[PDB]
Structure formats: structure tokens, C-alpha cells
Amino acid sequence: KIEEGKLVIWINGDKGYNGLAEVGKKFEKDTGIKVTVEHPDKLEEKFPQVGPDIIFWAHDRFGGYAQSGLLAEITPDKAFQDKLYPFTWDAVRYNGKLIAYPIAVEALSLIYNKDLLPNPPKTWEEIPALDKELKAKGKSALMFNLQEPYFTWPLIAADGGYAFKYENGKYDIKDVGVDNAGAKAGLTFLVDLIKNKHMNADTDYSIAEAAFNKGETAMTINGPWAWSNIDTSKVNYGVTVLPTFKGQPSKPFVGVLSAGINAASPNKELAKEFLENYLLTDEGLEAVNKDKPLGAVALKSYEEELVKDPRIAATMENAQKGEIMPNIPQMSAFWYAVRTAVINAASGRQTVDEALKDAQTRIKEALAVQKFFLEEIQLGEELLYEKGVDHLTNAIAVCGQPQQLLQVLQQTLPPPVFQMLLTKL
């Protein structure tokens, strides 16, 4: 339960929640206001029904919440806004409005074996000639997870690929950038690396991880979650900017850990105080970071301390150049479609032109049917009378797997018309 005059905060169990509680203790000591930090299971699933004053989560989940009116519009002090990197505020916009405070950023980087490769390539275009040189030493230039588009997208996006178009704190779900010239150029380059034997279509996460950590390949592409394993390996590794393609940066997907204020909270001013005046400060972020590292942070002054570790600076440089993950549920359709596209193209079964054509179709069709399905059901629920079993049957005709739906339809409402329903199937 939310109560006036205290704060309850949720953050996931993998983050520095004891450090966050220390910030909370400071806050309580100065203000008298009790701050309770929790890390519930399924917190991001529970928020919409019963939630706390403040929630910390990846920004992309917050679009759903905002679509439902569940987040307060944040109203940051004017000089404070300039204290965070501008691109981070773009991760916390929904329908043009600020709906959370950004805290930290995460993206892929290029990770390289400094002994094998003292001069990591600035361009993707250099990698074929480098691989040929390394192969003459029993080694390879690059291995990374080719199976998941999260990993291959940075290259595909570089010359102009994008998921959905972002402009003035909004995404246009009609404007999908999967089959444009830039996406084709990048996926062509990837496919070509494989046809020319510089990478293997079956390389996945485990295989690339083990190869880099055994000193068999000079580069991999991965995120901060992978550093600890490389530490154990003793490889003399560096983390740096991704190579450019056609003179443009690789654009990894960026996740931004963000803090949202519950629209239902009677403590919104206190939440702001906590977040702006206590948490998003050198001392506040230090407290969290000491407990469990935040990675690269949104607060410039503290990021400037953290980049003593050059790996953090690399995360940030790649994030600044990357594509913020769109905070809209239409992204689910993007991932399924592109995953297939890249696999088929990397295999040789489809042209690049054709795989990305399929993917763009898939995305358009899935979004249309999802809408159609809701719309047809709403005409359905206006049978209070029928009329709308034809509409219901239209919605059912669309579902590949209608058993689950047929169940609940037998509930609401009348068996005589469930009967009718059955007729049309």
C-alpha cells in the first residue's frame, strides 16, 4: 500500500537495491520521510494493478504504462535537465511527454584482444582483410552471436535501417525501416562476411563467447553482462567503439534504466525530491553503483568519474550513437520478423532484398491483424443484441491457435449463441 507521507520504491533484484536503500536512509534522516525499497518478483507485471510510489525498470516497458495513464508526467527543474545527457531524456518520452527520469544506459560494444589486435578496426570494411591476416596465424578476426537480431542490428541499422521512426517524443508505427536501402546494405555486408568465410552462419552466443575467451578470435560484440567472464579468462581485452559501416556508426539498441512516478501516488513532490535531489547526484549514484554497478549513467558529472574505467566510456559512446529501444508494444512484431530475415539471408536461402521484404511484410501484417482482431471483438462486445457472432468469428478466424479464446467465449455469455458461433467456424 501507498500512503501519503512515505515513499515505497520498486527495483529489480539484479540491481543495487541495498545501495538505493542507503540513499533512502539519507533521505529519511534529512526529511523525516520513510523510504522503503523492495524488489518483488514480477514487479513489472504487478505495477499496473497495485504499485509503489516509484518504479525502476528498463525505459521500454514504460510506454505500456504510459499508454494506460499509469505514470505521472515528470516536471524536472530546468537546470537539472541539463545535468543529464540529452539523448537519455529521449528514452523517457511518450506521446511527447516526459514520463520518467533516466538513470543509466546500456548498449553493446566492440570487445577486442589487445595482444592479437593492438589496432582494432574503425570500419567494418576493414574486417575481411584483417580476418585473412589472422587466419594465416590460426586465428579469426571476429565472432559474435549471429542468431539474435539484438546482436546483428547494429550493423544493419548503420547505413539507415531502423525499427520505427522517432520524432518529437513519438514513434510512427506506420514507418518501419527494415527493408530500406541502409538495412539492405548492412545485411548484405554481414552475409558477404559469411559467404567469404570470415564468419560462420551457426555462430551463436556460446560459441563466440568461448572463442573470444579462449584467445581464438580477436573481436567479439557484447555487452557489460559479459565482462566478468572475460575477466576470469585473463584475456588482455579492451572495450571500444563499434566499427563504422559506410562511414556511419553501428547503432546498437540502447536500454535506459529509468525511474517512473506512479500516477496514483499522493507523494509526487516527495518522489521528485528523492529522485532529483538525492538519487541523481554524485553521492546518490555512488551509493547504488558501489552496491551493484550501474554501468554508464545519465548524470554527466558522475559518468565523468566513472569513465576512469574506459569500458564504461565505451558503453556510453556506443549508446550515444545507437537507437534507443522503442517503448511501444509493436516492437514484439519487429523482433520475430527480423530474426527470421537475418537467419534466412545469412544461410543463402533468400536474397537480402527478399528476406527484408518478408520481414517488413510480416511486421505490417502482424500489426494489422492485431488491430483487426481488437476492432472485430469490440463490434463483438456490442451485442448488448447480436448481430456480432459474425464479428467474433472474424476475430477467431484470425487466431492461429483459437482454443484459449474459444474457452472464455463459452463463458461470456449464452450457450444458444455459442451454438451459433460454432456454426460459423
- Main-chain dihedrals φ then ψ at residue 392, nearest 5 degrees: -45, -40
In the numeric block, which cell numbers belong to residue 80?
537539472
Q: Rounded to an integer, what distance in angstroms lies between the CA atom of residue 190 and that of residue 356?
A: 13
169 torsion bin: left (phi>0), alpha (psi -120 to 50), beta (else): left
DSSP one-letter string for 300-360: HHHHHHHTTSHHHHHHHHHHHHSEEPP-STTHHHHHHHHHHHHHHHHHTSS-HHHHHHHHH
Contact 248, 321 (CB under 8 A): no
151 closest CA partner among 88, 104, 204: 204
- Residue 382: Cβ-neighbour burial (10 angstroms; 0-12, 13-18, 19+): exposed
DSSP one-letter string for 181-197: HHHHHHHHHHHHHHHTT
292 closest CA partner among 334, 342, 257: 257
Give the other-Cβ count within 10 Å of 73's Cβ: 12
Q: Which residue has the cell 544493419?
A: 156
Give the other-Cβ count within 10 Å of 4's Cβ: 8
Distances (CA, A) of 178 to 29, 163, 174, 242: 52, 6, 12, 21
Q: Which residues contact 133 (CB under 8 A, 6 or more apart)?
A: none
Q: Rounded to an integer, what distance in angstroms lies between the CA atom of residue 143 and that of residue 208?
A: 5
User: Which residues pair with residue 112 across a beta bridge?
Assistant: 219, 238
Contact 88, 325 (CB under 8 A): no
In the numeric block, which cell numbers belong to residue 228?
566478468
Residues 326-355, buried b or exposed e (16+ Cβ, 10 A)? bbbebbebbeebbbbbbbbbbeeebebeeb
Q: Rounded to an integer, what distance in angstroms lies between the CA atom of residue 363 and that of residue 335?
A: 9
Look up residue 134 and give its amino acid: L
Q: Which residues contact 385 (CB under 8 A, 6 or more apart)?
A: none
Look up residue 177 and give its amino acid: G
Q: Strand (E) positions, 183-250?
A: 217-222, 237-240, 244-245, 248-249
Q: Residue ranges of the alpha helices (H) in 47-158?
A: 62-67, 78-81, 86-89, 127-135, 149-158
Contact 256, 91 (CB under 8 A): yes
Structural determination approach: X-ray
What is the 3-class SS of 347-413, one letter each residue? HCCCCHHHHHHHHHHHHHHHHHHHHHHHHHHHHHHCCCCCCCHHHHHHHHHHCCCCHHHHHHHHHCC
Give the other-Cβ count within 10 Å of 177's Cβ: 18
Residues 248-287, buried b or exposed e (16+ Cβ, 10 A)? ebbbbbbbbbbbbbbbebebbebbbbbbbebbbbeebbbb
Contact 359, 341 (CB under 8 A): yes
At what resolution in Å was this solved?
A: 1.8
The dihedral formed by the CA atoms of 343, 347, 352 and 357, expressed in degrees to the nearest 10: -50
To 10 degrees, what angle do helices 149-158 and 331-347 make?
80
The dihedral formed by the CA atoms of 39, 254, 350 and 372, expressed in degrees to the nearest 10: 60
Contact 151, 145 (CB under 8 A): yes
